Amino acid sequence: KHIVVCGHITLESVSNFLKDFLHKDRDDVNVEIVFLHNISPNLELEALFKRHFTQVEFYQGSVLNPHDLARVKIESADACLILANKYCADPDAEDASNIMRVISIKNYHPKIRIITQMLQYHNKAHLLNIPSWNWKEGDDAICLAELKAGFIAQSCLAQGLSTMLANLFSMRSYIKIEEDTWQKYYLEGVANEMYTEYLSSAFVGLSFPTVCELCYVKLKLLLIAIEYKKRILINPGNHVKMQEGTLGFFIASDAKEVKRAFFKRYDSTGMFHWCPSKEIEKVILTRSEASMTVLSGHVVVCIFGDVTSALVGLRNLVMPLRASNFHYHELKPIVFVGSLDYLRREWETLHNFPKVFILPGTPLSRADLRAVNINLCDMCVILSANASLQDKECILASLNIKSMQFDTTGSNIPIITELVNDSNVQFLDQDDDDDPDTELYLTQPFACGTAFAVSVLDSLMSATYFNDNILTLIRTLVTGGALEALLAEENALRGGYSTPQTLANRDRCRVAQLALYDGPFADLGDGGCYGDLFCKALKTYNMLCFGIYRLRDAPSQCTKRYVITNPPYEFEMVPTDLIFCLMQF
Amino acid sequence: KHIVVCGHITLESVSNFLKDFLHKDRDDVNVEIVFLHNISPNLELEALFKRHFTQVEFYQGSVLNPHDLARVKIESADACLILANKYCADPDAEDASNIMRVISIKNYHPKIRIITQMLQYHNKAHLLNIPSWNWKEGDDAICLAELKAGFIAQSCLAQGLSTMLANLFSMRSYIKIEEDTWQKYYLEGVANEMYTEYLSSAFVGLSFPTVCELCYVKLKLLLIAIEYKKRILINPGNHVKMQEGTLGFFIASDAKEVKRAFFKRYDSTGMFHWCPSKEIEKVILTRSEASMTVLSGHVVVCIFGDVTSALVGLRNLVMPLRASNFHYHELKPIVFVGSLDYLRREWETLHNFPKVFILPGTPLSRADLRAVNINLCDMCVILSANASLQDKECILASLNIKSMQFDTTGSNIPIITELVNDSNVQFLDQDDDDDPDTELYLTQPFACGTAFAVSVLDSLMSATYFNDNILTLIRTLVTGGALEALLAEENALRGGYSTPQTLANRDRCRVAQLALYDGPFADLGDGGCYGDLFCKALKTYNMLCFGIYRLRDAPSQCTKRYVITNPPYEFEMVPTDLIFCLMQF
Ligand SMILES: [Ca+2]
Ligand SMILES: [Ca+2]
């Protein structure tokens, strides 16, 4: 078996792809990776590669040349992966180019699995027009815009989820730092990767909750979702019972570890909160009108950009924040602080969502910022519209906010800065240890969920090759809902009257972050074991706890909290801890 | 005798020119071709050429240099041909440049025959301002914009006509594929080229129809038009009788084969349907206003482009669709799906034509597409406004439409994609055999009239040198009407009250495609010979049948039909066949 990787192939992209391919995964001996570029050979740089991995071959040529496709033997190949220029000049033009490859690869041999990256959502739709494109077979398209947005959105609900859900996906091994610092605990979690496995015949008929306990208690495998016979269910309630050989998504250290588990108020779907399309000027707040309202528990997304910028795809940020699993009362209002000229062009996708607001002005003016009462928000998202040196602004905005005093203090505000250049992470937190060479996942600002780069998702490519499900899990988890045709035929979203079959869909779980201090399970804090809590939390409310969001201190000063994924049954808690979890509805 | 070729002379252009010059034509020994470029000599590449053809000489220099013109001896030369940069950066600038050459060549020696290519129609007019320019002598200008448009227009009336009328013009020989596939039948037709010949004294006084039968039955030469003594008549009625030595246009395999034939509701002209100039906003349909009307039997021309694009010259697409040979009832309404900003600038030429509509929006949104009820149209033209890699859009649009389901199916819609790069043909039909090297005329999508490139017309250059008439035939045939001064003085077109002399001009024949199933001559189908049908069809209704538009199957599935030009008197029909023909009025 062999695969064909093509599209934007750079030294950096190849090296990154190879790392993620061959780590803890069960078998790597099987697949030969054949890269196909059209750039200058650079035989020397390639020469060494071939020596380290005997599974790697380089050929130049186009994906649009029937001879070259035959030369690389695309027809026989297990799958073909099309890498995109994430940091492209014109995003629309890039997708346009990539779509053509898909068309071509399908033209040569239709029965091929194609994994492809997409920069803009709206373009992802086009892929369905291609005859040979099988959404139901292996063909899948990783939309970078929609996922980047969703990950940041999921952080508004539970701060730090973005980086927790990212480290979980990138294949990485255990490090075991000897000295006592947060690094130790953070990395002990990082060591995770999320694997797919079939449930043992033993579990058949049991309730998911009881199965989940057995897996965690008897095996130390944190189970999060089943694949009912098809639709997938994340943390089902106690009623769900196992159907012969069910497929389960586990979060364990190594791939071999998981083997052991074998012994009109709504959208047409009723998934998202629909609202009558509103005219943009009805939403625009004056600086005063905004300062008048004391907003809190809201999301302040402040975007830089002018009329001639790439569309960030704000649709995908608000959508998961408007899922039906939250009550209208619970919904967080969203305030965009940007240029009106920029906003309006994107606006057309958002008019349907409720509690959306625009305050024209720059994220660098405190006047605009004080007006929207940042001190009070649950999350402040800082985005840079697309030369990457010009993201200097985001750092400035971030630093600005940290140095305010509301009368609370600026440094204690939930911020999440989207960075374009992983190197720039050094700057946003100014007490951390800095080095340009140090990987992003290891930096403090990332560990805490203060920062997030498009870079992080590149790992998904290989990961979604191995398990189709993985990609459909995350997309489902991150965006709220998923179907595509209603969404595809029109980019504008249809809203309908609720049927008892639609009001039924509200039953999906939801991400939340909880405290031990006010907790019903509070008694466990102040020294109790996480293992003892987890089970209690599960059986009593059907809650899944998969992470502690601890302060970076074990004297006390800072508020910054870092992420610990899937801690062991014997893990000492503290009163200050917070719990990442999936609650029922 | 010798000729001077100048202007845009590339390796590709030269090789193409030489192929079309020296094939089946009666005598090639007579003419020496002298190329005059101004690019870097590249003596080596040229060296070989001179060795294959002893009729070819290369000289560098300008056409604007009196010395160089004398050196190439332009004054003695039979004719001078000016090739243009079809795939130019700025079309207007290219014509500007070419016109200057014409001016210069005329300045040096006025009594010269000049054949020249023009990219935009509006510029073609300017050539009349040049004193030495003789529209009545040999001087003729092949306007690429007007012909490309007309060929596509002619396909709306009879699908596949574009490629039938193209293969007919490019000098090509018989191939005789042994195996039974559509290629065989298609190529047996392709082997045609349309030649000019004088009628034998024998035919004098007979009716065209009876002459036509004799030519087809006794000689196997399909005759299509006479040149009455001057004006030319395509398929005249039975009344027209031969005047001594008449000139006739025949469609035969070889040039020597033809030798054997020797043994206010209207425009000022009353040629085209005039309508009071309408204000653009009166024509613009909302998406709703359009979805409201169930349009069918119409043409959906959907153009990509913004305000800063080259003008496609839509005038020339609608004009042949608005000829007076059709009743107002019979007229096909035209819907443009594009950017309003782009359209309005072109619009000013169209306000005069009736049943014209604009639906602002992109050909990639199904909303806009479903609104205009594509399922129902007789033809859907896909155009790309002018870097040629950016025609990727046309393929996308084409694929989009094929994958829709109206509730009919998307794949069964009459589409014609204008391609800029002959190579890209591979992509539009995804069941055909693909190879970049394979010539365009041989590709399935072209064989069927699904695709059409500006490339195809390059053959005309040499062909119109040999017979002035040929060019005036096609232009007359393709655009409906032809005179130039009324059209030239103002680009806007004058409409007048009809006189009985103008209402007389409506008598021109018309292209149409007919079925055997519903046919009056239906009985001949299901096994009968085409020869037996042809004559019957001619004598009974004065119809000329010149082609079968057969399905590509001889089990059944596909709807795609390919073109067979001038089939023999002994040709087996089928019920599924269609007939290309010229009907009377
Ligand atoms: Ca720092
Ligand atoms: Ca093809």
UniProtKB/Swiss-Prot annotation, chains A, B:
Domain RCK N-terminal: 1-142, 296-407
Post-translational modification: Phosphorylated. Palmitoylated.
Gene deletion effect: Morpholino knockdown causes circling phenotype characteristic of hearing and balance deficits. Causes a dose-dependent increase in auditory threshold in hair cells; simultaneous knockdown of kcnma1b does not significantly increase auditory threshold.
Organism domain of life: Eukaryota
Location in or out of the cell: Cell membrane
SS bonds (residue pairs): none
Coiled-coil regions listed in the entry: none
Binding site for Mg(2+): E32, Q55, E57
Binding site for Ca(2+): N107
Entry function: Potassium channel activated by both membrane depolarization or increase in cytosolic Ca(2+) that mediates export of K(+). It is also activated by the concentration of cytosolic Mg(2+). Its activation dampens the excitatory events that elevate the cytosolic Ca(2+) concentration and/or depolarize the cell membrane. It therefore contributes to repolarization of the membrane potential. Involved in determining peripheral auditory sensitivity.
Self-association state and partner proteins as the record states: Homotetramer; which constitutes the calcium-activated potassium channel.
Similarity-based family: Belongs to the potassium channel family. Calcium-activated (TC 1.A.1.3) subfamily. KCa1.1/KCNMA1 sub-subfamily.
Free-text comment on this protein's domains from its UniProt entry: The calcium bowl constitutes one of the Ca(2+) sensors and probably acts as a Ca(2+)-binding site. There are however other Ca(2+) sensor regions required for activation of the channel.
Protein name: Calcium-activated potassium channel subunit alpha-1a
